[PDB]
Amino acid sequence: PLGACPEGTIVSNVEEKVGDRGALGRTSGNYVIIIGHNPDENKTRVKLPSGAKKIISSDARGVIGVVAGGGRIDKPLLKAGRAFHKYKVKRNSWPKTRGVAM
Amino acid sequence: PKKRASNGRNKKGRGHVKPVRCLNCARCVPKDKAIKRVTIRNMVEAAAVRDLSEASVYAEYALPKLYNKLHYCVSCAIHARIVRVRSRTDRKIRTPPQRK
Amino acid sequence: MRDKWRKKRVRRLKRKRRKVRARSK
Amino acid sequence: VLVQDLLHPSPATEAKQHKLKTLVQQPRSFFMDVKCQGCLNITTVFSHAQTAVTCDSCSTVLCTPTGGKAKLTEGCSFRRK
Amino acid sequence: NINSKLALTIKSGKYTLGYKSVVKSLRTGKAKLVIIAANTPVLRKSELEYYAMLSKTPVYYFQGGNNELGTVCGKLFRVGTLSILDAGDSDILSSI
Amino acid sequence: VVDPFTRKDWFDIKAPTTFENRNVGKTLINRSTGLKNAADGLKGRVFEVCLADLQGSEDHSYRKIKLRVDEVQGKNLLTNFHGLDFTSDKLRSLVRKWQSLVEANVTVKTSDDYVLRVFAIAFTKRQPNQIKKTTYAQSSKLREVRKKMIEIMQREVSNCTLAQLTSKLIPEVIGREIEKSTQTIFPLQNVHIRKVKLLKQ
Amino acid sequence: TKRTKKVGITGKFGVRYGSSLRRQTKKLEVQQHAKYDCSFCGKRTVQRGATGIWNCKSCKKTVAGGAYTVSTAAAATVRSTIRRLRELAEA
Amino acid sequence: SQVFGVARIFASFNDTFVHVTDLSGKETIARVTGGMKVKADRDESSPYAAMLAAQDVAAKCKEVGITAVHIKLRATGGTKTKTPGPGGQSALRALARSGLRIGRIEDVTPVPSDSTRRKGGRRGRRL
RNA sequence: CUUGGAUUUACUGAAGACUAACUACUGCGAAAGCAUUUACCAAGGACGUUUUCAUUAAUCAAGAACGAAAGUUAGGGGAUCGAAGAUGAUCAGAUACCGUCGUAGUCUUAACCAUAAACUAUGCCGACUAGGGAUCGGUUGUUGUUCUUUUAUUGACGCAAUCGGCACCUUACGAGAAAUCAAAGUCUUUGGGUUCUGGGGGGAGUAUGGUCGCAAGGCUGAAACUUAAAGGAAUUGACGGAAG
Numbered sequence A: 001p002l003g004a005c006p007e008g009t010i011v012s013n014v015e016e017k018v019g020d021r022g023a024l025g026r027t028s029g030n031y032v033i034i035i036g037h038n039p040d041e042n043k044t045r046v047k048l049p050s051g052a053k054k055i056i057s058s059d060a061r062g063v064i065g066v067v068a069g070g071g072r073i074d075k076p077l078l079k080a081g082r083a084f085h086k087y088k089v090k091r092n093s094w095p096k097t098r099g100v101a102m
Numbered sequence B: 001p002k003k004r005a006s007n008g009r010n011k012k013g014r015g016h017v018k019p020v021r022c023l024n025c026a027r028c029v030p031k032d033k034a035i036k037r038v039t040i041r042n043m044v045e046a047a048a049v050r051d052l053s054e055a056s057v058y059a060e061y062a063l064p065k066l067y068n069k070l071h072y073c074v075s076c077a078i079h080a081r082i083v084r085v086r087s088r089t090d091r092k093i094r095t096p097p098q099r100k
Numbered sequence C: 001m002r003d004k005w006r007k008k009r010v011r012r013l014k015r016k017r018r019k020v021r022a023r024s025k
Numbered sequence D: 001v002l003v004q005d006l007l008h009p010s011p012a013t014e015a016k017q018h019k020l021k022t023l024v025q026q027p028r029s030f031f032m033d034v035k036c037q038g039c040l041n042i043t044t045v046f047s048h049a050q051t052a053v054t055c056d057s058c059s060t061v062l063c064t065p066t067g068g069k070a071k072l073t074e075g076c077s078f079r080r081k
Numbered sequence E: 001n002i003n004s005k006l007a008l009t010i011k012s013g014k015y016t017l018g019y020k021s022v023v024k025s026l027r028t029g030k031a032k033l034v035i036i037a038a039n040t041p042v043l044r045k046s047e048l049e050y051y052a053m054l055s056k057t058p059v060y061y062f063q064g065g066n067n068e069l070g071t072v073c074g075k076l077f078r079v080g081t082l083s084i085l086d087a088g089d090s091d092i093l094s095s096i
Numbered sequence F: 001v002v003d004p005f006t007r008k009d010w011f012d013i014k015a016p017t018t019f020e021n022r023n024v025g026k027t028l029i030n031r032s033t034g035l036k037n038a039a040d041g042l043k044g045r046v047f048e049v050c051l052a053d054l055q056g057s058e059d060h061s062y063r064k065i066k067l068r069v070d071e072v073q074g075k076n077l078l079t080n081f082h083g084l085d086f087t088s089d090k091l092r093s094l095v096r097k098w099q100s101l102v103e104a105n106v107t108v109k110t111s112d113d114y115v116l117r118v119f120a121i122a123f124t125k126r127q128p129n130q131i132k133k134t135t136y137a138q139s140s141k142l143r144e145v146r147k148k149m150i151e152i153m154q155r156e157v158s159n160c161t162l163a164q165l166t167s168k169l170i171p172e173v174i175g176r177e178i179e180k181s182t183q184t185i186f187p188l189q190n191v192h193i194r195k196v197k198l199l200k201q
Numbered sequence G: 001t002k003r004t005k006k007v008g009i010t011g012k013f014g015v016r017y018g019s020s021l022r023r024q025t026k027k028l029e030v031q032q033h034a035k036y037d038c039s040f041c042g043k044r045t046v047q048r049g050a051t052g053i054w055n056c057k058s059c060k061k062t063v064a065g066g067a068y069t070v071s072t073a074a075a076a077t078v079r080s081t082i083r084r085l086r087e088l089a090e091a
Numbered sequence H: 001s002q003v004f005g006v007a008r009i010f011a012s013f014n015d016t017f018v019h020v021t022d023l024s025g026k027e028t029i030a031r032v033t034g035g036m037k038v039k040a041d042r043d044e045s046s047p048y049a050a051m052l053a054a055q056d057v058a059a060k061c062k063e064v065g066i067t068a069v070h071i072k073l074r075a076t077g078g079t080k081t082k083t084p085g086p087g088g089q090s091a092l093r094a095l096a097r098s099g100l101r102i103g104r105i106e107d108v109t110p111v112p113s114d115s116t117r118r119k120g121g122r123r124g125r126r127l
Numbered sequence I: 001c002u003u004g005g006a007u008u009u010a011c012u013g014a015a016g017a018c019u020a021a022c023u024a025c026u027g028c029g030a031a032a033g034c035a036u037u038u039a040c041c042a043a044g045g046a047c048g049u050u051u052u053c054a055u056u057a058a059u060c061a062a063g064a065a066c067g068a069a070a071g072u073u074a075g076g077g078g079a080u081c082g083a084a085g086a087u088g089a090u091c092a093g094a095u096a097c098c099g100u101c102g103u104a105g106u107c108u109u110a111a112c113c114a115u116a117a118a119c120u121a122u123g124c125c126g127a128c129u130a131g132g133g134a135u136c137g138g139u140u141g142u143u144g145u146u147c148u149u150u151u152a153u154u155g156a157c158g159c160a161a162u163c164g165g166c167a168c169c170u171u172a173c174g175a176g177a178a179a180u181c182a183a184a185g186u187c188u189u190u191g192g193g194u195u196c197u198g199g200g201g202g203g204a205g206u207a208u209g210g211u212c213g214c215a216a217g218g219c220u221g222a223a224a225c226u227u228a229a230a231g232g233a234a235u236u237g238a239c240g241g242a243a244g
């Protein structure tokens, strides 16, 4: 639980609400930083990967550490075939025709 | 030509000395070159040491001093007249001036 | 002129010379 | 000083000189006979010894090496040869 | 310091390198000390220390891995555990 | 407008029995209302009062004690020891040139599980018959003094509770014992335990 | 002999994609094809599976790592912060 | 018999703060600055404005009941100047002359171990 | 930026840097450089030596290591300062000085770059020539001094020698154009060994070629033409929005 982690704790797969089984900081290389606690109101302040500060119930849970597989974006894809294979198992959103060319 | 045998600093048997900032203008000056003055002044001027001693709740209370070490670059010191231009022969004298 | 700024001027003129020869290779 | 007897220096100033700067260089070290209190056995030990020498009779360290002359342990008396 | 003591024991005394040799020496009672590297699997560790408990043999836990224990023993290979059979010029059994 | 000082209630601060003048002073807080109690906003407060005031004597003028309140009994605040520090002017008057300064620190637990950091400071003393201008100690001597300092604070803290340690601090027992223990290493002056910090309560 | 002066592993890409992109591929692709030390058995038998998956051929231990290296700096920092906190003042 | 507060006087070279709190310092009793008593920026830090501000602080504190204070003089500190501004001495003398009683006086100027870079650049601020 | 509670005040926490005072005509390192504690790893000078080897040495084209800051590529970090930029003043104009923000950068990890008034503007090794007091390291002899502990084998301090250093003060036998110099002396009474560089000022560290570098650039590097001086140190005066 978020209240059981001291300030500055790097945590991952954090619950927005008690029991949704993980919502925040689930992508590769990402995490949530625990900024501080407010025990009187039973709330915890965290910093999300986007840089936003959020107030979550202190009963919400998270997993200690950084999500594995980080640094993936550092390498160029270099190829249309590489982007094709990337989205072949994600969804039909590639390639994109520019609207000005329609 | 060469003006000072010490090159205006105090670096001998040394390569580099870490710098300090002038108190007045914040100029980076090498620590050996800076004009340094140690001042230990009373926090209250002698005019007010009386009314403050009468207003003191302690009988025979010593006023604490203010300890400070001031660092000046050559420009800061010359402008503030901490040091002055001396004659060619008077430059060599390294005893502290006899004033205090 | 100041020697340092004259040097910068000469560096800029070498740059121009190099680009001009590179134009026709 | 233009005239001075270089071949016969005064022995007082000659003894203050560094060991390599005399007319003929000569070591200032010597050997001593050290008597431990426990027994009586002559053991020759170098004055500027670098080893913790122990006598054969009793396994007692006679001297401990220092930067210069070795320091004799307590109860050990030395006599210069 | 323990590296110097271990180098002296390997140079002058007797030892066995390897799990099978250590277990044989514990069965035969010929072991004076068993040294186990830090990255040894825990199941093997708790088995070596059950053998050492039965044999009444001290255990030293090396802080480095089997690569550092191997290079400490002057070997060009990895040593996961070792037993000291005869401390010679060293005093490791008297110090550990 | 409203003069928020009409709603302030004065409370008394009580020091441990280790000091003499237990009437530390007065504090104030918003009066307890239905929505907000005076107690919760008044407990947890830290008061910094000079040890010369806590002891009457002027020999302690350069040390000042932090007292942390953690229980309230009516109009009285029951404080506990929170820390020690030297005054800035005293330290600046002790740090001269042409002498060696030696410092040490240690993280230590009390008998009652009070986590402290204790900072010790000392300076080389110039002998009365000394002629040379400077009085410098070799870095090896400074390391040996620092080690003796470290093991003395460790012994004199791990063997006692926080109240007893405070009773040791008031007559400067630790500084004099460090000075006595380091006589055979190098002459020292102004040997003080200049700061103690509570980390966790 | 030495076969390529500077392209190295990116010599499979020929003249395409731009030199900056090819040297950017080379930096991370040497890391993803390197052999790493196993923290469990000590052998140099750790190789990447898919991204984030690092297997040891010898002891058959799989560890979660970075996309192209076994450990990222953020993970190294968390490992060291946790080891301190514990094996220290807090026991 | 007296009730001590803590008079935290911050005298920089651009302004002068006379801030009277309680003994703990978590409760502020009176805070009048030298910039609140004059309409010129060039003399917001004047000794006259600091003394008048301190006298008004003493008058407001007295009607609340604080009868004695400890003095904590400070300068700007940090990477900036370590000498107190000209108004802190006048505000202190005015406080002493206003019937308020003075206890211990200490300097609490923030002095860094080493520092964190100082503004002005390598060549300093020219003019 | 501020009645949306700024600034200030106390407690708590988080980030990165950085190591004040102590800090010096003091230390170490080949230089660049190096300043919180402790542990670990491997180095180093000097000193002491009646230990060991015996010319193994000195300086060095080619060839190498390191090399402040800035700068380049990619991650990390990115508090403070802050090129560029934005902004408020001043001004005839200021895209300058001054004020408030601010991106690269400042920090770190993998690689590059190889330049500084990188200065002691003084190559390295060796010998000799003059007095003095300080100081750091080591060694060797010794106190009307304080101290361990109550004393010794405590340590500190004091007095002498010595070797090595960082330097300093006086004189000028001597050198120099002089400023000045214990080396910049032992140079027309010219020769201890050796490496590098210069031949009036510009053109010009330019053009070209080569080579290294991702780039910025680095190293090597002319000629045509032009010119009677450029320059060094000191003297007298004049002037200063420098001091008395």
Ligand SMILES: O[C@H](c1cc(C(F)(F)F)nc2c(C(F)(F)F)cccc12)[C@@H]1CCCCN1
Residues within 6 Å of the ligand: A006, A007, A008, A009, A010, G077, G078, G081, G082, G084, G085
């Ligand atoms: O509160 C801080 C803190 C930081 C960090 C980290 F850097 F990883 F984000 N992790 C902390 C953790 C964590 F569990 F490792 F996450 C616990 C407590 C404090 C932490 C400081 C700094 C580390 C040592 C003491 N805690």
Ligand SMILES: [Mg+2]
Residues within 6 Å of the ligand: A092, A093, A094, A095
């Ligand atoms: Mg499609």
Ligand SMILES: [Mg+2]
Residues within 6 Å of the ligand: A096
């Ligand atoms: Mg697209």
Ligand SMILES: [Mg+2]
Residues within 6 Å of the ligand: A101, A102
């Ligand atoms: Mg169309």
Ligand SMILES: [Mg+2]
Residues within 6 Å of the ligand: B001
């Ligand atoms: Mg000039």
Ligand SMILES: [Mg+2]
Residues within 6 Å of the ligand: none
């Ligand atoms: Mg040196």
Ligand SMILES: [Mg+2]
Residues within 6 Å of the ligand: B015, B016
């Ligand atoms: Mg330099």
Ligand SMILES: [Mg+2]
Residues within 6 Å of the ligand: H127
């Ligand atoms: Mg000016």
Ligand SMILES: [Mg+2]
Residues within 6 Å of the ligand: H113, I019, I036
């Ligand atoms: Mg410090």
Ligand SMILES: [Mg+2]
Residues within 6 Å of the ligand: I027
């Ligand atoms: Mg030193």
Ligand SMILES: [Mg+2]
Residues within 6 Å of the ligand: none
């Ligand atoms: Mg060469």
Ligand SMILES: [Mg+2]
Residues within 6 Å of the ligand: none
């Ligand atoms: Mg970057």
Ligand SMILES: [Mg+2]
Residues within 6 Å of the ligand: I078
């Ligand atoms: Mg930034």
Ligand SMILES: [Mg+2]
Residues within 6 Å of the ligand: none
């Ligand atoms: Mg800024």
Ligand SMILES: [Mg+2]
Residues within 6 Å of the ligand: none
């Ligand atoms: Mg403008």
Ligand SMILES: [Mg+2]
Residues within 6 Å of the ligand: none
């Ligand atoms: Mg500006």
